[PDB]
Amino acid sequence: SSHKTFRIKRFLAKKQKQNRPIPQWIRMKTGNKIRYNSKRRHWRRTKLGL
Amino acid sequence: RKNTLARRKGRHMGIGKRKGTANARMPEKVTWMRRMRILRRLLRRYRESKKIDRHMYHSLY
Amino acid sequence: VQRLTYRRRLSYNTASNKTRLSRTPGNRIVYLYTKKVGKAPKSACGVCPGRLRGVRAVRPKVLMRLSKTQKHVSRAYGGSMCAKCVRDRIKRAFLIEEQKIVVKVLKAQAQSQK
Amino acid sequence: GRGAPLAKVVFRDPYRFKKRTELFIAAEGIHTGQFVYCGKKAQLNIGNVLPVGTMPEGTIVCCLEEKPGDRGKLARASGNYATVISHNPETKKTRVKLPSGSKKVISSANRAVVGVVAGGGRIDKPILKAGRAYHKYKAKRNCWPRVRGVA
């Protein structure tokens, strides 16, 4: 919506923060087995549901 | 503008270029309104100009 | 020939938004929202269809800005009643009090004999 | 949702300095400005309310009470009235004939406005179509469609 409330905007803020790629400085960490982020949500494919 | 001048002169206004009713092209109500207003203000002017008294003005109205 | 848009978030032609289009000094047309017209007050028990004269006809919350001289009439029942009903009530009151005096003196003249 | 008109009557409070507004059933034959008298020793006229124990027999009244203090429950529809037919000084009772033809005995202390309810003959007009019946019942309640049981 064009106008929303503070709670919904704060909830969307964390999704915006989380929708970020994997940093390239942890790939060389000892014991690291993460190759790519499996929680990347697309605005068109997967709807977060309010 | 040339076609409008032709319409004003009377061209392209025959029966073959009419697609609406007569009451749709010129409303009988507004024709009656004009014909009534003209005669009514003419009668007002004639009564004011002392040409006709009120007893004749009412019977003419 | 130039189609303009609304200026607020309201998108429905409701009663809250009545737009009239005006021309700016910048040579362009734009809507302006108009406040709903205020109706002049009507008298109490007086003439029904006739509103009160001399009283400013504007919205209720605007009456805080208006002066008392522009919200009432100098006579009694100025901004509350019309002119006809004021003198009507005056005559009615005077006449019914005179009738009370008449019935009192009638009771007295009947008591003086009976 | 009602055929009988509602007359607003303003009385003067006998204990406080204030005007009391009441909504009575406008009996047929009253106009705005007519003084209406409410009490025991009120004059017998159209519109005035007064206990049934004081009115004579054969008085055509309406908007009466079953019990003293019931505040106008019987004979409230448009064009209906109740007929006082008997009186009893001792063991105060009063026989009245209601619009249904039933003769009921009631107390002699409850009141009744004199006159027939305005809006009589309201049923003489045919609805003449379903639209008017729909517009009539939309103000009353959702009970009009009335589908038959055998269907």
């Binding site: - | - | - | 055929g3 047929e28 009253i30 705005t32």
Partner: protein, 91 residues
């Protein structure tokens, strides 16, 4: 300019709703819309506002009367009997 033979105000309905129903509703369609003489002012301005409500256009003295007429033949005799009972034996 006689435009209709027998049907009057109920000519707006047309061919529907039957014949006897229109004939019966016409009698009161004549009355409920005709202006009456005000018993207080004296002018023929007594257009009905709602069911049983009749207000004048001059003094606006509204009166409660019949649903389709200014007064009903039943209320007339009711008022007559009320007056008679009031005058008999001092109310």
């Amino acid at each position: 300019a006689k435009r209709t033979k027998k049907v009057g105000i109920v000519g707006k309905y047309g061919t529907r709703y039957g014949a006897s129903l229109r004939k019966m509703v016409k009698k009161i369609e004549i009355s409920q819309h005709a202006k009456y003489t005000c018993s207080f002012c004296g002018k023929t301005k007594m257009k009905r506002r709602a069911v049983g409500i009749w207000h004048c256009g001059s003094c606006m003295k509204t009166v409660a009367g019949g649903a389709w007429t200014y007064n009903t033949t039943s209320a007339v005799t009711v008022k007559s009997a009320i007056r008679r009972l009031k005058e008999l034996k001092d109310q």
